[PDB]
Amino acid sequence: LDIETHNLTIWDLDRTFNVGGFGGKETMTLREVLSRLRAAYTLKVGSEYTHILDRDERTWLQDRLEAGMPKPTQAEQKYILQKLNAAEAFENFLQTKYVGQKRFSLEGAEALIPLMDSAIDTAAGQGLDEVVIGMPHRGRLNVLFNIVGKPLASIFNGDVKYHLGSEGQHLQMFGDGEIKVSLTANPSHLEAVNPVMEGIVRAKQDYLDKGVDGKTVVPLLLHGDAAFAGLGIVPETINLAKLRGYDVGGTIHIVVNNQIGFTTTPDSSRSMHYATDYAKAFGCPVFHVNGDDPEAVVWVGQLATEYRRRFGKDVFIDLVCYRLRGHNEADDPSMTQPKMYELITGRETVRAQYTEDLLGRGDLSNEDAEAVVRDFHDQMESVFN
Amino acid sequence: ENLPAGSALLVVKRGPNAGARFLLDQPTTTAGRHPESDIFLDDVTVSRRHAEFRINEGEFEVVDVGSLNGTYVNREPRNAQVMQTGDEIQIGKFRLVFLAGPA
Numbered sequence: 001l002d003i004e005t006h007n008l009t010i011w012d013l014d015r016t017f018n019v020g021g022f023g024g025k026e027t028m029t030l031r032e033v034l035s036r037l038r039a040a041y042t043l044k045v046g047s048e049y050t051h052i053l054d055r056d057e058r059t060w061l062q063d064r065l066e067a068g069m070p071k072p073t074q075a076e077q078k079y080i081l082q083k084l085n086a087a088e089a090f091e092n093f094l095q096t097k098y099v100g101q102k103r104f105s106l107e108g109a110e111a112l113i114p115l116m117d118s119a120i121d122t123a124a125g126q127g128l129d130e131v132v133i134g135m136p137h138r139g140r141l142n143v144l145f146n147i148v149g150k151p152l153a154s155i156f157n158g159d160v161k162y163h164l165g166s167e168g169q170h171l172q173m174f175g176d177g178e179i180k181v182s183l184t185a186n187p188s189h190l191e192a193v194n195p196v197m198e199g200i201v202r203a204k205q206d207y208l209d210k211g212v213d214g215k216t217v218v219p220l221l222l223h224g225d226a227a228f229a230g231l232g233i234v235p236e237t238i239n240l241a242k243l244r245g246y247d248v249g250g251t252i253h254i255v256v257n258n259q260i261g262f263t264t265t266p267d268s269s270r271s272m273h274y275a276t277d278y279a280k281a282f283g284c285p286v287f288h289v290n291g292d293d294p295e296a297v298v299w300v301g302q303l304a305t306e307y308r309r310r311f312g313k314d315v316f317i318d319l320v321c322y323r324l325r326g327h328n329e330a331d332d333p334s335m336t337q338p339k340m341y342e343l344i345t346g347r348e349t350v351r352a353q354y355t356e357d358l359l360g361r362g363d364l365s366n367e368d369a370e371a372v373v374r375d376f377h378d379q380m381e382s383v384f385n
Numbered sequence: 386e387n388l389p390a391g392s393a394l395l396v397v398k399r400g401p402n403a404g405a406r407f408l409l410d411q412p413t414t415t416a417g418r419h420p421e422s423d424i425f426l427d428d429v430t431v432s433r434r435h436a437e438f439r440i441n442e443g444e445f446e447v448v449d450v451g452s453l454n455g456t457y458v459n460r461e462p463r464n465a466q467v468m469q470t471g472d473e474i475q476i477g478k479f480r481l482v483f484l485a486g487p488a
């Protein structure tokens with residue numbers, strides 16, 4: 001990626017070259033070529049797509065990634081801020097009003113809530129029937145309140161809340177679409193829900209009976225980074241994707257990459273460079289996204305749901321975040337990883353950072369600016385009534 | 386229909402409590418996520434104080450009182466508007482329909 005490796009120097013930056021339709025142009029300067037390549041492939045979204053064999057599906061991804069993320073409207077921007085406010089408000093209620101919930105915290109990975117919302121909303125606009133979710137413990141009660149839509153009374157009243165299943169409806173803010181949302185039951189044994197969830201989706205598709213052009217129930221599956229690279233059930237289930245009795249039209253995969261297992265680091269967890277490298281065995285695209293840029297996270301959710309409907313294959317999203325607290329209720333993570341938890345302790349939250357960025361681009365009026373402040377107090381008063 | 390003269394009605398077309406009916410018959414009526422609101426609409430998308438409905442010389446008006454998401458009348462953002470029968474009003478993810486009474 002250095003210009004010295006390709007026998008080019010600073011003296012070539014303002015000379016013009018033939019580029020063969022790159023950026024919809026025949027000629028361009030090296031300065032302009034470098035600008036565009038860096039804007040497309042080196043900021044907050046990293047893409048792996050050139051290993052795909054079909055020319056038509058390689059060109060579709062190339063054109064969308066090099067056009068860039070569209071500039072979102074003010075209304076859109078305020079809707080992303082309201083979801084982050086709700087996510088953080090619920091984390092505070094759980095930590096204060098109940099005990100032994102530090103294990104199950106989503107603090108560090110609050111952008112998960114606006115990513116899942118983006119995908120479910122895109123599916124409702126496509127005209128599809130249901131979304132089935134499978135996931136582990138981390139963030140489960142947050143997903144029950146902010147994505148499935150259960151009341152607080154229902155959540156807080158055999159087995160625990162962290163393993164039972166639920167159903168709900170998702171209406172579309174800026175459209176006329178509705179869609180059902182379901183959450184599957186599972187044990188503590190990691191990744192054992194993967195094949196069970198796929199089977200539930202195929203049974204529901206068969207009952208609707210819409211043919212090959214159908215496939216109108218979307219599977220959304222959440223993993224952790226250590227479990228995804230380590231347990232063999234993960235690639236065993238992806239191998240059923242294109243077979244005759246087992247095909248469900250693709251699976252959207254989200255890997256929450258918080259750069260730690262329990263007391264174990266990625267060096268001692270996998271022999272692959274990234275955790276999502278099984279994608280290159282099955283010929284599918286991978287999007288790596290920064291969990292502290294919420295506008296980039298909502299774009300990747302939309303693009304992945306559009307790729308599934310067009311090509312009917314699996315798609316993989318890597319959400320790079322961190323884990324604020326330890327896995328145990330009373331356990332110090334600096335005991336084993338002291339250098340990593342120097343960087344983590346005493347940061348600003350993703351909500352705080354995004355509020356500061358909107359109030360410092362001068363788009364918002366005086367009346368509009370007061371409202372952004374008051375929204376976080378409203379969400380808090382509501383949960384603690 | 387059998388509505389008293391000078392009154393009006395709002396009915397929930399789309400939302401969790403769809404089919405619910407509310408009666409506009411007093412000079413000011415409040416609508417939001419505050420539990421002491423006249424029209425209580427419980428959802429994350431609605432603000433604690435969101436809009437008021439006001440009756441002034443036999444004429445019905447909607448007014449935004451400083452919400453984050455704003456109020457829409459027939460899929461167009463407005464700060465105040467006088468409503469005619471069969472108009473769609475959006476407060477969050479709730480959509481309501483306005484029906485006048487006898488004069």
Ligand SMILES: Cc1ncc(C[n+]2csc(CCOP(=O)(O)OP(=O)(O)O)c2C)c(N)n1
Nearest residue numbers: 138188189190224225226227258260261262
């Ligand atoms: C099959 C199985 N093996 C081992 C465990 C023990 N276990 C519980 S939590 C955990 C760590 C998982 O780490 P990761 O998948 O990276 O996600 P994180 O919880 O850090 O988000 C392990 C090994 C388990 N629950 N199930």
Ligand SMILES: [Mg+2]
Nearest residue numbers: 224225258260
């Ligand atoms: Mg992890």
